[PDB]
Each structure stands twice: as C-alpha cells, then as structure tokens.
C-alpha cells in the first residue's frame, strides 16, 4: 500500500485541479441563475375585469414619463397626449427618442413608468404581459424571421389551423413564393430567411395581425425599402385602419407619416410638437425642411 501512495496523491491532485476548473464554470452558472427579474403577472383580476382584447383604442396619457437607468434621465417628461380612438395616427419625430419611448410604453417594457395609461379604459400594468403582447402587432426595424414551418412560425402560440391564414399570407405578398414552396402553409423556413425577399418581415407581421385580429398596430422605422415596398406598407396600413380601426406609425419619413390622421414629434427628452390634423405638420415648414 505504501508504493501506491505517490500515484494516489498525484491522481488526487490532478483530479482536484480538474474539479476546481469545472467548478469555476459551475459557480459562474450558479451566479447567472441568481438574476431573477421579469415577473410576468398583473396586480388585478385578469378573468373578466380587463377587456378581452383592446378594440376602441381610447387611451389617454396622464403625465407619463419613462426612464431606463433606475428612473433617472427620462426620455419623456409628463407626456400627456390625446390619442385618436377608432382611427390611425402616425407620429414621426426627427429624433428616435420619442419613437423609442413610445415603443417601450406600448408594451410596458420601460424600466420606469412615471405616469398612468388607460389601455382601452383599463390599466396597462394590471394586465397579463403575454396577452398584451399577443393582442398587439408590431413590426421590427430589420427583417427578423425564425427557422421553421410557416404554420408553426406565423402563429405558433395561436396554433390556428384555418386556411384563411394561408389565404391571407398568399394574398398580401409573395404569392409566387408561396405557390413555389411545396409545403405552402406548413413550409419550413430556410435558415430564418437567409435567401428571401426583404418583405418577408412585413408579410409575417401582416399575417400575425390577420390571425390575432389585433386592433392596435405598432410600426417602427424602415431601414431600407423600395418604392414598391413602401407602397405595399402604406396599403397594409390603410387596410389595417379600415378593418382593425387602429394603427400607430413611428418613423422619420414625413412623406409616409403624412398619410395619417394626426402627426406628432418628440425630441430632447420631451414632446416637441403635436399636430392634430395632417396639414398642420405642413403648416410648420421647419419640420418639412428638416425632413427634406
């Protein structure tokens, strides 16, 4: 037994070193597990007290302020603007601070919310976040698509098997692509649209809006789009305003934003200018000159 002592000690030390090396990563994982946040719940009864789905869109901002860095240096200062229910209003600002604040406040993603918002006559913070995001369509700045079957990609959570979704997808855009795809409704994506038209994101957003029947629509800036793409986007916005009766457009293109009931701009951490009619923006030539 004495002869084996040296090899036993050597193996013990080597295994202890390896165990410590692996336990370093184990401790890193455990420390990462200590980051507990993002509690998806509501401080009210969500059975029947809130609306099943916001349709009127009668939301009144009452001195709403949003900040990220622990409620410090907010991008909004008592924002209280009267939105137009039952109509599409597109607010375009030269600076992206207003659009970012609006996007954060729409889904309550802002870290700090100094104010009150009545979402369709009900509180926004007292509603399920999952339901709120499911019943509110939104587009992205850049085309982002997952890799999977279109039936399992367009409405994975809804899991609706109606052929109306496929009909709407083939009618909105990429009819030739849908016809050429052997799967069709259940066609699998190719590396998340690695080789696909730039309008795939817009088509997916339109299909999601059609499926979920989200009355309120949220729009973001377009990094790059052709004239035909812009015309199709405008047609989709008009269709949403006709059917869903609510649409919100946020971008920096004055020509696109002019096709809306109301226009507003926010800059320097506060509201810059609000124009209830569309012609009021053209009345103030400063914003028109800045845009073009």
């Amino acid at each position: 037994y004495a002869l084996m002592v040296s090899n036993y000690l050597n193996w013990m030390v080597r295994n202890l070193a390896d165990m410590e090396i692996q336990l370093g990563a184990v401790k890193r994982i455990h420390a990462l597990l200590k980051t507990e946040a993002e509690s998806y719940e509501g401080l009210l009864a969500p059975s029947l007290i809130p609306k099943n789905w916001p349709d009127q869109g009668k939301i009144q901002i009452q001195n709403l302020s949003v900040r990220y860095d622990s409620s410090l240096k907010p991008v909004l200062k008592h924002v209280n603007a009267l939105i137009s229910p039952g109509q599409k209003i597109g607010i375009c600002g030269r600076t992206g601070s207003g659009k970012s604040s609006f996007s954060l406040a729409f889904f309550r993603m802002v870290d700090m919310f100094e104010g009150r918002i009545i979402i369709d006559g009900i509180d926004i913070a007292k509603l399920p976040l999952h339901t709120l995001r499911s019943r509110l369509s939104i587009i992205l700045q850049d085309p982002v698509l997952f890799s999977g079957t279109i039936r399992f990609n367009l409405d994975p959570e809804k899991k609706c098997s109606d052929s109306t979704l496929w009909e709407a997808l083939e009618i909105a855009q990429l009819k030739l692509v849908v016809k050429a795809l052997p799967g069709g409704l259940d066609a699998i994506i190719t590396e998340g649209g690695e080789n696909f038209s730039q309008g795939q994101r817009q088509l997916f957003c339109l299909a999601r809006a059609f499926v979920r029947k989200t009355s309120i629509f949220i729009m973001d800036e377009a990094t790059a789009s052709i004239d035909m793409a812009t015309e199709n986007i405008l047609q989709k916005v008009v269709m949403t305003a006709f059917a869903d009766r609510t649409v919100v457009t946020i971008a920096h293109r004055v020509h696109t934003i002019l096709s809306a009931d109301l226009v507003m701009v926010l800059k320097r951490g506060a509201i810059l200018e609000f124009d209830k009619p569309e012609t009021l923006l053209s009345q103030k030539d400063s914003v028109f000159a800045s845009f073009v």
């Binding site: 090899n7 999952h130 339901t131 499911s134 997952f146 994975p156 959570e157 998340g192």
Partner: protein, 99 residues
C-alpha cells in the same frame, strides 16, 4: 445549441411576439432528444468504469482460488502473495492505457 442560438439572436422579437414558450417547447423536445444520447453515454461510461475497477479484483480472486484449490502446491506464503499483489497493481496502469 444552434436552435437556442437562433432563439437568442432574435430574443427581443420572440419576447415581444409572446412566442417564448412556443419555442421553448421545441427547446425542451430537443433537450430530451439529446438527453437520451447523454443517458446512453452515461451508461456506457459507467460500464467501462465498473469493468476497469472490477477486473483486477476478479483476477486476484480467481488466481487465489485456483492456487488454493486446483493446485494446493504451496501454503500461500506472504512473500509470494504480496509480491503478486504489487505486480498486479503495477501492471494495472499499462493495461488500461494500451487501448
């Protein structure tokens, strides 16, 4: 890993689209699929470790039983028994590394 990297790359979009659980279902399915192979690997390495640990003891037992019963030509002198044990302990290391 490729699937979860695809999920995390568009994590903001997935969170805003309320499809996190929908994709997590496929994540769990793939995790079970990999866990089956991981369990097979664990079983195979358990068998390997058990054989490695039990081979020398079984060989020593067989040698001693054979010498005592079949041969019975010696009184099992310690000078032979412990020498054989030391030789087996020495030869254990090359045997499990030759493969």
């Amino acid at each position: 890993l490729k699937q979860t990297n695809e999920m995390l790359r568009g994590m903001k979009l997935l969170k805003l689209y309320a499809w996190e659980s929908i994709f997590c279902s496929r994540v769990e399915v793939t995790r079970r699929k990999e866990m089956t192979s991981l369990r097979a690997f664990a079983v195979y390495t358990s068998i390997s470790i058990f054989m490695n640990t039990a081979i020398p003891i079984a060989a020593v037992l067989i040698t001693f039983v054979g010498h005592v019963s079949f041969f019975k030509e010696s009184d099992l002198s310690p000078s032979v028994a412990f020498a054989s044990l030391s030789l087996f302990h020495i030869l254990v290391t090359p045997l499990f590394l030759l493969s």
